[PDB]
Short mmCIF file of C-alpha atoms and ligand atoms in Angstrom, two decimals:
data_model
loop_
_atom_site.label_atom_id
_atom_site.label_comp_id
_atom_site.label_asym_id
_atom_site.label_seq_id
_atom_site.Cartn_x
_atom_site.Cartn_y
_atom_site.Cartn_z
CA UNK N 1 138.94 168.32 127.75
CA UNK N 2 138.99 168.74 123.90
CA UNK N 3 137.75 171.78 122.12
CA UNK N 4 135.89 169.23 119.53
CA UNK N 5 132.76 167.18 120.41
CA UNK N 6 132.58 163.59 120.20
CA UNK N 7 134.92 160.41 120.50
CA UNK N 8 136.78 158.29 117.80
CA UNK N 9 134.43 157.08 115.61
CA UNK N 10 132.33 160.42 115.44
CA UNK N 11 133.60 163.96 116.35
CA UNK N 12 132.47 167.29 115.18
CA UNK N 13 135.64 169.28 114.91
CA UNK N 14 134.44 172.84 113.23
CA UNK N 15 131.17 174.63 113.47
CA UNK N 16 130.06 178.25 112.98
CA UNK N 17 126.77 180.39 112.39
CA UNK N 18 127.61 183.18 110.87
CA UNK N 19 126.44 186.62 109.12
CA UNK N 20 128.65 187.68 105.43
CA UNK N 21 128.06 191.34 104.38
CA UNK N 22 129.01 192.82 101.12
CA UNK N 23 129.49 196.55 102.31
CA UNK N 24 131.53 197.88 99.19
CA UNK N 25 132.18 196.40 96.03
CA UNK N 26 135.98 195.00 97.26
CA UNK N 27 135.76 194.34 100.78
CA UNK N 28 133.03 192.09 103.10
CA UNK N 29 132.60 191.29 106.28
CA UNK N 30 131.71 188.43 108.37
CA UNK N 31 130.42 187.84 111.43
CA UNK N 32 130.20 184.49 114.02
CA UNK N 33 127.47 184.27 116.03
CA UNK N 34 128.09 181.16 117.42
CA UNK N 35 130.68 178.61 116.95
CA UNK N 36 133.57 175.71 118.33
CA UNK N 37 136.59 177.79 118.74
CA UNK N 38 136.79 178.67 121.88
CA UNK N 39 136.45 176.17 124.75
CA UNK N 40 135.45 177.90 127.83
CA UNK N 41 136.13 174.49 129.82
CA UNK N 42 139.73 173.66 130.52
CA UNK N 43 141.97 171.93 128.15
CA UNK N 44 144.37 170.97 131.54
CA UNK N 45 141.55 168.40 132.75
CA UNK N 46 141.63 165.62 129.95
CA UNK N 47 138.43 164.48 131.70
CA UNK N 48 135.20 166.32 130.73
CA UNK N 49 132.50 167.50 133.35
CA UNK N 50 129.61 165.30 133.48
CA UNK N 51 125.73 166.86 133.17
CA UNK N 52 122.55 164.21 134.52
CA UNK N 53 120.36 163.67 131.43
CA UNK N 54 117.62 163.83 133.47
CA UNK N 55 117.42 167.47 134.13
CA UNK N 56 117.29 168.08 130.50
CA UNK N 57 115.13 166.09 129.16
CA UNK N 58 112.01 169.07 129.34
CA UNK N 59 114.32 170.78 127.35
CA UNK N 60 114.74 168.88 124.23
CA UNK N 61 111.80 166.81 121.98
CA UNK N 62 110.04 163.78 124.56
CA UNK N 63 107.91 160.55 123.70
CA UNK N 64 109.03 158.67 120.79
CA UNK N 65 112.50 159.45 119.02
CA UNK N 66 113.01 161.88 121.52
CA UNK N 67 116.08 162.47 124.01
CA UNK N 68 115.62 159.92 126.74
CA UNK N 69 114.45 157.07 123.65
CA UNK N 70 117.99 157.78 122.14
CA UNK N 71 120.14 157.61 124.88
CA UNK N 72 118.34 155.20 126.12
CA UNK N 73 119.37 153.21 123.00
CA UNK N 74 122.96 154.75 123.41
CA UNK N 75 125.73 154.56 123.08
CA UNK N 76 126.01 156.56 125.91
CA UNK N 77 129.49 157.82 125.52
CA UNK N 78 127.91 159.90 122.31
CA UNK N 79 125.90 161.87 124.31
CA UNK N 80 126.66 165.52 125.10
CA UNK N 81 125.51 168.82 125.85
CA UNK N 82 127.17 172.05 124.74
CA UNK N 83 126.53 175.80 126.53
CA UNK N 84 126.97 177.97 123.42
CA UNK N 85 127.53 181.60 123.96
CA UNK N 86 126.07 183.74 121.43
CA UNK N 87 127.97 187.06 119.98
CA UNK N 88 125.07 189.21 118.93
CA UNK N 89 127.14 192.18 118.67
CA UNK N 90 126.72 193.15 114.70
CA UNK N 91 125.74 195.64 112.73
CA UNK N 92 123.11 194.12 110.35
CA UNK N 93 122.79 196.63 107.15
CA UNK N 94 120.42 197.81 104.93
CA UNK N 95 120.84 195.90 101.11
CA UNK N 96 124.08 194.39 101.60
CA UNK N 97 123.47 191.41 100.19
CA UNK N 98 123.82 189.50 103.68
CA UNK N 99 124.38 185.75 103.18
CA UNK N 100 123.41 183.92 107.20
CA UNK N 101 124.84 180.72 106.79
CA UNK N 102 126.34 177.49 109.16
CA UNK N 103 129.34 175.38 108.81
CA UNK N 104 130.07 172.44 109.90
CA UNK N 105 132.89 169.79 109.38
CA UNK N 106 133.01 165.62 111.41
CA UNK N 107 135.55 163.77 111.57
CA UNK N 108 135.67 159.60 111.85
CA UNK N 109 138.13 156.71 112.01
CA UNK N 110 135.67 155.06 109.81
CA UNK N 111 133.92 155.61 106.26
CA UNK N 112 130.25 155.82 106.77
CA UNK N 113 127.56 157.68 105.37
CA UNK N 114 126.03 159.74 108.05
CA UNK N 115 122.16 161.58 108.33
CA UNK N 116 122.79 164.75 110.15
CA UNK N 117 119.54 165.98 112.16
CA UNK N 118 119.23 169.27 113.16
CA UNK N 119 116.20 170.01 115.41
CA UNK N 120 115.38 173.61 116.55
CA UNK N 121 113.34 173.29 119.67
CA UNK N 122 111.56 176.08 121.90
CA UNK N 123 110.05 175.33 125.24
CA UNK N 124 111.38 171.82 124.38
CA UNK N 125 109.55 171.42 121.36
CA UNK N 126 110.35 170.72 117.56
CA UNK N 127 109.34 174.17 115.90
CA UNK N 128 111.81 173.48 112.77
CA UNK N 129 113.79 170.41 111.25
CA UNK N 130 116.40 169.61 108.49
CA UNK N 131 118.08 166.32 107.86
CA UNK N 132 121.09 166.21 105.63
CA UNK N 133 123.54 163.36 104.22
CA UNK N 134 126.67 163.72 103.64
CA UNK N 135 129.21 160.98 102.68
CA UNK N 136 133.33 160.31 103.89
CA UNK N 137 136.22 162.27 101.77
CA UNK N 138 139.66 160.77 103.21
CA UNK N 139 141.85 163.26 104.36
CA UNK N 140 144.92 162.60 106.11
CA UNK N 141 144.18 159.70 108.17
CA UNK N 142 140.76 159.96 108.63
CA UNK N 143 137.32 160.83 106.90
CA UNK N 144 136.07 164.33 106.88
CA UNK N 145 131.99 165.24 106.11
CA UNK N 146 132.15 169.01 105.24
CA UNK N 147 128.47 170.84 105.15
CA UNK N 148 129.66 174.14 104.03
CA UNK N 149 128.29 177.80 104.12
CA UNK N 150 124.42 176.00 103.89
CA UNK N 151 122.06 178.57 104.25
CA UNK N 152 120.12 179.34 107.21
CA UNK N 153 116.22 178.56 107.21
CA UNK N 154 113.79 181.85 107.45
CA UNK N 155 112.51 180.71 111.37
CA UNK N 156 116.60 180.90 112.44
CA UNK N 157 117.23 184.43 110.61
CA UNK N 158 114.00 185.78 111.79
CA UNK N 159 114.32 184.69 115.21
CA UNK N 160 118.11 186.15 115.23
CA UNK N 161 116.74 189.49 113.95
CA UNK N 162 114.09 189.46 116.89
CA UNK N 163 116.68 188.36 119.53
CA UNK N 164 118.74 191.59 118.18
CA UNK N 165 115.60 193.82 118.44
CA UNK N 166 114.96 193.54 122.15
CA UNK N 167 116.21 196.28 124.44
CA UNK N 168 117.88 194.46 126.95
CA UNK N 169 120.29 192.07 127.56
CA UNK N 170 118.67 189.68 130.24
CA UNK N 171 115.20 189.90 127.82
CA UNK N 172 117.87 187.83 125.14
CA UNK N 173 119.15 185.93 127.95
CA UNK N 174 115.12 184.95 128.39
CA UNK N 175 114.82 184.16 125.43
CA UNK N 176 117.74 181.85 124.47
CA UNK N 177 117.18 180.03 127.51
CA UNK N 178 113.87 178.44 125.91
CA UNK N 179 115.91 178.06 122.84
CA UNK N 180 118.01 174.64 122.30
CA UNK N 181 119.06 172.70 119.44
CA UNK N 182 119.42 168.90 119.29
CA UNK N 183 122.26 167.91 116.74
CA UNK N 184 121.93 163.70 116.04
CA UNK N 185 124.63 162.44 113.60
CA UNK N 186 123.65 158.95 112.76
CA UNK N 187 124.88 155.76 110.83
CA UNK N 188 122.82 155.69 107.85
CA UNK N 189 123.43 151.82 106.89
CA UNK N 190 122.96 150.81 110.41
CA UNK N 191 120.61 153.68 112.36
CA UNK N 192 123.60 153.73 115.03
CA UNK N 193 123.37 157.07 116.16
CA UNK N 194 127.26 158.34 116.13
CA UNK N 195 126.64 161.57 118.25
CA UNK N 196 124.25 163.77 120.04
CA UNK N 197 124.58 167.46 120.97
CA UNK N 198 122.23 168.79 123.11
CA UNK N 199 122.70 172.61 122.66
CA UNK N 200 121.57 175.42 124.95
CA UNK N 201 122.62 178.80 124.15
CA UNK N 202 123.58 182.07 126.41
CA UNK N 203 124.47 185.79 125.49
CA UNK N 204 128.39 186.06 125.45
CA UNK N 205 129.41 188.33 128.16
CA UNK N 206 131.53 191.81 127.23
CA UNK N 207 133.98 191.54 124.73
CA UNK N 208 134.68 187.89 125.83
CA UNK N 209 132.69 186.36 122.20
CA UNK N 210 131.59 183.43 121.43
CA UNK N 211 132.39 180.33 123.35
CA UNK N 212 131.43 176.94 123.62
CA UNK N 213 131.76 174.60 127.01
CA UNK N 214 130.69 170.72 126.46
CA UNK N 215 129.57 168.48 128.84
CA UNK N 216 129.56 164.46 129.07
CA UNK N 217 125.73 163.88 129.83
CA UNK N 218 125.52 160.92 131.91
CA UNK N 219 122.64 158.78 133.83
CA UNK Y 1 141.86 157.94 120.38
CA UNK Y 2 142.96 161.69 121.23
CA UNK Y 3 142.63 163.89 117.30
CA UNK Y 4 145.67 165.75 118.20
CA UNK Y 5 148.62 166.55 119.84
CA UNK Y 6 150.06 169.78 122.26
CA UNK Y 7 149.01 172.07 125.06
CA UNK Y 8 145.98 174.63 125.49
CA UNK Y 9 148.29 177.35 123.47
CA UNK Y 10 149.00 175.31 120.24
CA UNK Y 11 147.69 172.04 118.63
CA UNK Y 12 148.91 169.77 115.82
CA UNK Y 13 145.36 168.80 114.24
CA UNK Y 14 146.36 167.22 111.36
CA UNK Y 15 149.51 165.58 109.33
CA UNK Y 16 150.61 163.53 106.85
CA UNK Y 17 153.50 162.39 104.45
CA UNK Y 18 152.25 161.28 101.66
CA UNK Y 19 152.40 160.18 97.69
CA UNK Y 20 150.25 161.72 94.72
CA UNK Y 21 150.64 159.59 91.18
CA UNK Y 22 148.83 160.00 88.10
CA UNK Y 23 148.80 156.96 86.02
CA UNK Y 24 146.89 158.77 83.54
CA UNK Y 25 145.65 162.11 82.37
CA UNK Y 26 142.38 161.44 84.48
CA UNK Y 27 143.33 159.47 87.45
CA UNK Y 28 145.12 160.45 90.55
CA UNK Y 29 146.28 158.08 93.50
CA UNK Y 30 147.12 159.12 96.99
CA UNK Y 31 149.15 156.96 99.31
CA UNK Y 32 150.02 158.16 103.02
CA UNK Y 33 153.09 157.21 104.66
CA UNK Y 34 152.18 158.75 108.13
CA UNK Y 35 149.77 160.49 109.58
CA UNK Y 36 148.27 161.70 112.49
CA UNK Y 37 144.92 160.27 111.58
CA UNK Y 38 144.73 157.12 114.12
CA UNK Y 39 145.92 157.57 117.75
CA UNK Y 40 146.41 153.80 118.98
CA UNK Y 41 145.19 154.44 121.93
CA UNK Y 42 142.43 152.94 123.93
CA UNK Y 43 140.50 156.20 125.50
CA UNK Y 44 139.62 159.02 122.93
CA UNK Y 45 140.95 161.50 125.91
CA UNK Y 46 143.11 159.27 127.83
CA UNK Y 47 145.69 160.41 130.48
CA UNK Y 48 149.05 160.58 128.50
CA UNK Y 49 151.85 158.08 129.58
CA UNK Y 50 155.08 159.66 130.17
CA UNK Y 51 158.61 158.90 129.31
CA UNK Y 52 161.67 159.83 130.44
CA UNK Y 53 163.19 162.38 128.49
CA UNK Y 54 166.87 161.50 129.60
CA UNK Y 55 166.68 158.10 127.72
CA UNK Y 56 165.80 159.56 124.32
CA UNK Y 57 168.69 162.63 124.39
CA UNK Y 58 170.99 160.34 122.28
CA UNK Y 59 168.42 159.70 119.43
CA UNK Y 60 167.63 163.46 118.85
CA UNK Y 61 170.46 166.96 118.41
CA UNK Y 62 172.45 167.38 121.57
CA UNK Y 63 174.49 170.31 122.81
CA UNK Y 64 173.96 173.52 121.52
CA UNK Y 65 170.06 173.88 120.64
CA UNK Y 66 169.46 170.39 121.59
CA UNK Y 67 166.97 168.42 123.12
CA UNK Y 68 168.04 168.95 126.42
CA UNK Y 69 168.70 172.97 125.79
CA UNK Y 70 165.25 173.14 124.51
CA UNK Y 71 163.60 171.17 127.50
CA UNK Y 72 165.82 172.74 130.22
CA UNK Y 73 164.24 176.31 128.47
CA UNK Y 74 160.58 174.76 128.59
CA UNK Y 75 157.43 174.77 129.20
CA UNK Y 76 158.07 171.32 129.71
CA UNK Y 77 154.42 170.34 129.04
CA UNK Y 78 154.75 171.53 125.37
CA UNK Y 79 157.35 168.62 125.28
CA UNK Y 80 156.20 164.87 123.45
CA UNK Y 81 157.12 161.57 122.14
CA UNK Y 82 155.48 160.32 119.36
CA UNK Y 83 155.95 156.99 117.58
CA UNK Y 84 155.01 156.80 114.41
CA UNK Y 85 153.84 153.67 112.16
CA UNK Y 86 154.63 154.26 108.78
CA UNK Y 87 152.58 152.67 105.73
CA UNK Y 88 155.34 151.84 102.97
CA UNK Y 89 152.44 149.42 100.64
CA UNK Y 90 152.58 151.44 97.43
CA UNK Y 91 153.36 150.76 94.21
CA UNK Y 92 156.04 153.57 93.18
CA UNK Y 93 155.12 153.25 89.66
CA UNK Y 97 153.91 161.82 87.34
CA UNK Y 98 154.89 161.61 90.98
CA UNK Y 99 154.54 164.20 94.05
CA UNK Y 100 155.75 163.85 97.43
CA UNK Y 101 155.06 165.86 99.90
CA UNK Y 102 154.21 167.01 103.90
CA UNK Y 103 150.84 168.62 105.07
CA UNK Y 104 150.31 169.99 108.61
CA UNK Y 105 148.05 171.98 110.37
CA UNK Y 106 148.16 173.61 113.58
CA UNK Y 107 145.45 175.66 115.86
CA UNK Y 108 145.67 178.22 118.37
CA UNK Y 109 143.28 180.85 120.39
CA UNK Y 110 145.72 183.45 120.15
CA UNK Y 111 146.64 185.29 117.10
CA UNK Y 112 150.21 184.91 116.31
CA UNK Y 113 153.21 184.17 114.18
CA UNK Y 114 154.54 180.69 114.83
CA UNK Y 115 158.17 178.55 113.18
CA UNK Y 116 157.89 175.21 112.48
CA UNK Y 117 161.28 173.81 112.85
CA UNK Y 118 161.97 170.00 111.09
CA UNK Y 119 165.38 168.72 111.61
CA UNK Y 120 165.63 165.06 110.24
CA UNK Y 121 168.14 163.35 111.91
CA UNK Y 122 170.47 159.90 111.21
CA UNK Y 123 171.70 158.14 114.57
CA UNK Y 124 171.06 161.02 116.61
CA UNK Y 125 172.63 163.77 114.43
CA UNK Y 126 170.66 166.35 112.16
CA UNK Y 127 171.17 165.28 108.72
CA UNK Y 128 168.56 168.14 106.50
CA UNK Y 129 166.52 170.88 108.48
CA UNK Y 130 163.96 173.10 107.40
CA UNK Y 131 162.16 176.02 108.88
CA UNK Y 132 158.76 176.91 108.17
CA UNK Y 133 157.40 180.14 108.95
CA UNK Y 134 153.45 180.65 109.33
CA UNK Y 135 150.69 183.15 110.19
CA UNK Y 136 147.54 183.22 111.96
CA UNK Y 137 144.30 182.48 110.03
CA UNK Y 138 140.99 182.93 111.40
CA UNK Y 139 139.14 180.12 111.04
CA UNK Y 140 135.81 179.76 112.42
CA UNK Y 141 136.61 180.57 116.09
CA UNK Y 142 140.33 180.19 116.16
CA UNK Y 143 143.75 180.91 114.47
CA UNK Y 144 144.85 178.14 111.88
CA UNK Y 145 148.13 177.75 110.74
CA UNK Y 146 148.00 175.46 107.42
CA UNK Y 147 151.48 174.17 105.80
CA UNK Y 148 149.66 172.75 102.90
CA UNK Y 149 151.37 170.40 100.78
CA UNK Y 150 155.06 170.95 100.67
CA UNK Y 151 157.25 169.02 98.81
CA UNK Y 152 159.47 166.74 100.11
CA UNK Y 153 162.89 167.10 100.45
CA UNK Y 154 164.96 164.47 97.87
CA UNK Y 155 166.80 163.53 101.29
CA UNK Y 156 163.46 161.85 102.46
CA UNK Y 157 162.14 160.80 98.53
CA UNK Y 158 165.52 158.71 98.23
CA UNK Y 159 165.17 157.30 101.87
CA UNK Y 160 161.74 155.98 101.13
CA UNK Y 161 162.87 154.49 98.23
CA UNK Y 162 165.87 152.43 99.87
CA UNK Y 163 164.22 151.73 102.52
CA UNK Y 164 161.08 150.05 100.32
CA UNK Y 165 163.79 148.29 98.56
CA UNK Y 166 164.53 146.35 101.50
CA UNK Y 167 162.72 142.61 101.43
CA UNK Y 168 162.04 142.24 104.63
CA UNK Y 169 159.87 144.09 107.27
CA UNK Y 170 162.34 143.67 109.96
CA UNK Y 171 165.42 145.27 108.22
CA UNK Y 172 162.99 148.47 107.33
CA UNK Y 173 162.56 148.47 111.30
CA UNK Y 174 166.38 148.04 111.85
CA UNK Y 175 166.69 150.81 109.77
CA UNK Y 176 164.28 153.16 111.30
CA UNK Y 177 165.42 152.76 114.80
CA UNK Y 178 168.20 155.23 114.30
CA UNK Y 179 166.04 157.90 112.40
CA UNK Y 180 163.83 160.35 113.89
CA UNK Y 181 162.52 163.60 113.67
CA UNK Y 182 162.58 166.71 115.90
CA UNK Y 183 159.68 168.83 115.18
CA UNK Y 184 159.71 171.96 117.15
CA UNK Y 185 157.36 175.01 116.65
CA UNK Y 186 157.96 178.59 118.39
CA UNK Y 187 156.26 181.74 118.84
CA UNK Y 188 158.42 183.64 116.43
CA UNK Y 189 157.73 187.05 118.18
CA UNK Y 190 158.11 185.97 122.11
CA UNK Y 191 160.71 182.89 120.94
CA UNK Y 192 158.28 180.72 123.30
CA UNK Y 193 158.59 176.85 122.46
CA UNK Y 194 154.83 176.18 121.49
CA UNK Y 195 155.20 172.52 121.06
CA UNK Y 196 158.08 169.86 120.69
CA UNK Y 197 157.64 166.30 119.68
CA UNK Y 198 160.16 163.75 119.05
CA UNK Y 199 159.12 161.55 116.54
CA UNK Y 200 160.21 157.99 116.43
CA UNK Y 201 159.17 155.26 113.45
CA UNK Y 202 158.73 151.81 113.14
CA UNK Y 203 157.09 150.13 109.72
CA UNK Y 204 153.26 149.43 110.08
CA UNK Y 205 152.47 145.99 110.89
CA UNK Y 206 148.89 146.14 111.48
CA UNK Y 207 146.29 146.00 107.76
CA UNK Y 208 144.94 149.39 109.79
CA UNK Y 209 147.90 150.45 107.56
CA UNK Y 210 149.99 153.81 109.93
CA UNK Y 211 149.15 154.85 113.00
CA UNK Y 212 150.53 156.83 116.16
CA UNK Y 213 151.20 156.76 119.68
CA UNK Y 214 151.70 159.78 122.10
CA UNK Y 215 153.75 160.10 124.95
CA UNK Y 216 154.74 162.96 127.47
CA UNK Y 217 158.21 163.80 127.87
CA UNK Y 218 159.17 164.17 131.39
CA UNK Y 219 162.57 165.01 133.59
C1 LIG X 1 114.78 173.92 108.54
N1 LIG X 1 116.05 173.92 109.26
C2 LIG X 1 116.25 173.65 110.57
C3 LIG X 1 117.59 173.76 110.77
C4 LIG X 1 118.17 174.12 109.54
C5 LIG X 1 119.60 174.36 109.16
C6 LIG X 1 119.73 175.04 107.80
O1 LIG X 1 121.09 175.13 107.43
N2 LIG X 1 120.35 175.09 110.18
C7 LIG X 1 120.09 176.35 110.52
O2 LIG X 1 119.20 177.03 110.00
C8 LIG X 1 120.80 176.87 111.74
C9 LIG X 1 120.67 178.22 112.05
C10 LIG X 1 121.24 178.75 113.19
C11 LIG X 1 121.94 177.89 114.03
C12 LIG X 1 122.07 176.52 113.74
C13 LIG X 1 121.48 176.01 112.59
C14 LIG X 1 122.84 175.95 114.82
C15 LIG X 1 123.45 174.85 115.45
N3 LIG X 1 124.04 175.31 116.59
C16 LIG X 1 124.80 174.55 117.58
N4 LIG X 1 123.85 176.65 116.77
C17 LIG X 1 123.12 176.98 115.69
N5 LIG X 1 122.64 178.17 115.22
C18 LIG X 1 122.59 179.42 115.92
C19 LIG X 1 122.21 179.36 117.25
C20 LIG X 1 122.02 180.53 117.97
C21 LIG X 1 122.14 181.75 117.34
C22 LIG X 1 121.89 183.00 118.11
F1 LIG X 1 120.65 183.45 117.92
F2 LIG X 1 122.00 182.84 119.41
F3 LIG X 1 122.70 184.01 117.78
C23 LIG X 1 122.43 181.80 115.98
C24 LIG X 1 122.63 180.63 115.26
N6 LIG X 1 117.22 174.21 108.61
C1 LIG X 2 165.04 170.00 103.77
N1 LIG X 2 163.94 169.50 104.59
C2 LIG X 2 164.02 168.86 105.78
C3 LIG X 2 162.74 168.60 106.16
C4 LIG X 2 161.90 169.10 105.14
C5 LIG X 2 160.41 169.11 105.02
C6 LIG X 2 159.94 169.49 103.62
O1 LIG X 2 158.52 169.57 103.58
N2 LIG X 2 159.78 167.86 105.46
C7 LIG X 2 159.99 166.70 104.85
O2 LIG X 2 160.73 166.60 103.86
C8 LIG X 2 159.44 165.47 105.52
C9 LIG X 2 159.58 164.24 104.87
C10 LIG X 2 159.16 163.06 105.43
C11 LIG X 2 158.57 163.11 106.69
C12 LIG X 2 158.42 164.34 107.38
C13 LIG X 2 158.87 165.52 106.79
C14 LIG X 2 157.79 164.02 108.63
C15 LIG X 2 157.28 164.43 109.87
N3 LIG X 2 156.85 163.31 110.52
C16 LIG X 2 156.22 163.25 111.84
N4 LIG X 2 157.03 162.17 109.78
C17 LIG X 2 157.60 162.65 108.65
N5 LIG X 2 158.02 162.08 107.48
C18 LIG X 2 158.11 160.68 107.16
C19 LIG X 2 158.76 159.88 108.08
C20 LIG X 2 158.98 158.54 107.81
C21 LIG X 2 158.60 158.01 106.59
C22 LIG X 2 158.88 156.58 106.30
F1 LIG X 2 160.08 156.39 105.76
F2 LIG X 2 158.89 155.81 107.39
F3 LIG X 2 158.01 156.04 105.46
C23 LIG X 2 158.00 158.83 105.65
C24 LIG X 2 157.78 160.17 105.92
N6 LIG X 2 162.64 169.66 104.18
#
């Protein structure tokens, strides 16, 4: 299907996490460790591949507000989960005023003011949180909510520098595969949730980069 | 429904034809004439309808470098129909006009974006738009921001505003369209063709589009 993630009245069309280096006073660098721009599932298919909820739910937040309450609540066609594969392949130098940072840019047929959850989980469990707001700016046809270049918190840079540190790749493979991140994009005047994105992350593979593969999560 | 148009090599993500006026030193009003902003269609990844190409050749360039050269040539499934409902409620009272589009690819290259505007079937104005590769969070971008329009199109708009009636606007518009064809400039590879047809806006949704394949 589509290389963005969501339907008509909520899709999340751009998203990076990214490293910027200042190496020399007129040049930098940047660096994507994750991000949306490369579908690894076929555009061909219009139809996505479908994932049963059910065997992730120990994988994400449980009990109240957590990921069987919400789609429970629905609407179900909101619901998704997205492999991530991780580029980890940069050099991270000594004072060079390194800025980590994520993107992230939705799209809707309707203007809404939206609460953006981001939980970080490991072993299925909240370890960090952030909830932003962001409000509709019409652009060509539809409204765009832009979070740009915000700053990564301290657990997500730490826990990058310690997935970097290991000496092999299967021990980051390990790793990441406890890792997830549940991404909630809710109606703030109504508490309709708008989209979910359950995230669970891999190492990219050779010089193949980052790439992204989304799933409809059904039942 | 479906955010944009094209095949797995090249997407049209966004568009519009708009109007920028500033009544006054601080105020600034944008109007959109079309856009690619709300696909009337049902399913957000529906299965395209197709149309036969053979029944549009007379409302689009023929002979050499025509629609028929250029579908003969292929890949056919770079090839759609697009109808187009155009928004033409503004006041025309400091006054810009101009195009926006935006195209995506996973492969770095130089692309042409051809626009021939055309008047029962024959190209009245072209232009030719050349554009390269931005990396963008992921993928290559190519971004045609804001270009004016051509007077050709200003003055239509305004005649075609002048008209009282909704229906004579549509009798109008059913012998203009728009042949928008973009190319891999280095391999000459059509990277996508759509035929754009128009009709005035009927529904208070205001413009709106509606995609169809182009088949033999
Ligand atoms: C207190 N708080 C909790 C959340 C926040 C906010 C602050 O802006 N967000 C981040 O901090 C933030 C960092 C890294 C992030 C993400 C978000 C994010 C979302 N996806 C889909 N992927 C993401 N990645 C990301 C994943 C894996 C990798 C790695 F290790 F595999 F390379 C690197 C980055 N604040
Ligand atoms: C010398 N030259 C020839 C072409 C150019 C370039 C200059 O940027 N493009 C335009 O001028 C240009 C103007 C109007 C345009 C478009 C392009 C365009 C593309 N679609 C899909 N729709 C479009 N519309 C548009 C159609 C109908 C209406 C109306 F009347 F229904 F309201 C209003 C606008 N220069």
């Amino acid at each position: 299907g589509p290389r963005s993630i969501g339907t008509t009245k909520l899709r999340l069309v751009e998203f990076s996490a990214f490293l910027e280096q200042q190496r020399d006073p007129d040049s930098y660098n940047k660096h994507l460790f994750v991000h949306i721009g490369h579908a690894n599932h076929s555009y061909s298919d219009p139809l996505l591949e479908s994932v049963d909820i059910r065997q992730i739910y120990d994988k994400f937040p449980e009990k109240k507000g957590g990921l069987k309450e919400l789609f429970g609540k629905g609407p179900q066609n909101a619901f998704f989960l997205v492999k991530f594969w991780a580029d980890l392949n940069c050099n991270i130098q000594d004072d060079a005023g390194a800025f980590y940072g994520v993107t992230s840019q939705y799209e809707s047929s309707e203007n809404m003011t939206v609460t953006c959850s981001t939980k970080v989980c490991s072993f299925g469990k909240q370890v960090v949180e952030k909830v932003e707001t962001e409000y509709a700016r019409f652009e060509n046809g539809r409204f765009v909510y832009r979070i740009n270049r915000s700053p990564m918190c301290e657990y997500m840079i730490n826990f990058i520098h310690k997935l970097k540190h290991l000496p092999e790749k299967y021990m980051m493979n390990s790793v990441l595969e406890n890792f997830t991140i549940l991404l909630v994009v809710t109606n703030r005047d109504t508490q309709e949730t708008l989209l979910c994105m359950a995230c669970v992350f891999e190492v990219s593979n050779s010089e193949h980069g980052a790439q992204h593969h989304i799933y409809r999560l059904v039942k």
